[PDB]
């Protein structure tokens, strides 16, 4: 049967769950236990991490504007997500979503990762740009696994200390 239920109005669903799109991530999954992970992300969010997703991610900015901070070579870049843009992110491109606008909404689609395909979360030095800290995880929820991770980074000066220049990353106000 229709395991994921019947079709429904998306604009109206987003209006109804707007109150639930909370920071740091601003996440919300539309269907549970499905192979496609379909989420709506709103603003304002708070992200200092770069995600290393080992699969592709699809974006469609439905309301408001946002941008992804990226590493493209070793260079800091930004891909803008103006209202109405779509974007397909290749695997492993480090990205840090910035969602400043209240009432913002972006459709974000990813797939369940196979066992032993791990996500990376990375922070980089503000001063020298060297990698400061990386955690790899077998992700089981993009909604409710993210903020505990950021938490233990923020709460610890040794994790935030650049191993190249010794600058201590600002953590939860970067």
**Which residues of this protein are in contact with ligand 3HA, per CB under 6 A?**
25, 27, 41, 51, 53, 57, 97, 99, 106, 108, 142
Where does this chain bind its own copies (CB under 8 A)? 1-4, 6-13, 30-31, 34-36, 38, 55-56, 58-61, 72-73, 79-82, 84-90, 93, 107, 109, 111
Q: Residue 94 Cβ, how far from Fe ion at the closest point, in Å?
A: 9
What CA–CA distance (Å, rounded) separates 5 from 7?
7
| Cβ–Cβ under 8 Å, residues 68 and 98 | yes
For tokens 């870049």, the residue is: 77
* Nearest C-alpha neighbor of 97 from the set 151, 23, 160: 23
169 to 54, 69, 82, 93, 164: CA distances (angstroms): 25, 17, 29, 22, 12
CA atoms within 13 A on the CB side of 160: 18
Residue 113 binds what, of Fe ion, its own copies, ligand 3HA, none (CB under 5 to 8 Å, by partner type)?
Answer: none
Q: Is the peptide bond before 144 cis (omega within 30 degrees of 0)?
A: no
Partner whose binding site includes residue 11, from ligand 3HA, its own copies, Fe ion, none (CB under 5 to 8 Å by kind): its own copies
Q: Choosing among its own copies, Fe ion, ligand 3HA, none, which partner's interface includes residue 127 (Cβ < 5 to 8 Å by kind)?
A: Fe ion
Show the site string, 114-143: x = touches Fe ion by CB under 5 A, - = not: -----------x-xx-x-------------
């Amino acid at each position: 049967m229709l395991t994921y239920g019947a079709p429904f109005n998306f604009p109206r669903w987003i209006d109804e769950h707007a109150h639930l799109l909370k920071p740091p991530v601003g996440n919300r999954q539309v269907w549970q236990d499905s192979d496609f992970i379909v989420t709506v992300v709103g603003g304002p969010n708070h992200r200092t991490d770069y995600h290393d997703d080992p699969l592709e991610e699809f974006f469609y900015q439905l309301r408001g504007n946002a941008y992804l901070n990226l590493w493209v070579d070793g260079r800091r870049e930004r891909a803008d997500l103006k209202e109405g843009d779509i974007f397909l992110l290749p695997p492993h491109v480090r990205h840090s979503p910035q969602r400043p606008e209240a009432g913002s909404a972006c459709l974000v689609i990813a797939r369940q990762r196979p066992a032993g395909m791990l996500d990376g979360f990375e922070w980089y030095c503000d001063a020298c740009g060297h990698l400061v800290h990386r955690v790899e995880v077998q992700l089981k929820s993009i909604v409710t696994d993210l903020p505990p991770l950021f938490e233990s980074f923020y709460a610890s000066e040794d994790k935030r200390r650049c191993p190249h220049c010794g600058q201590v990353h600002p953590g939860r106000a970067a």
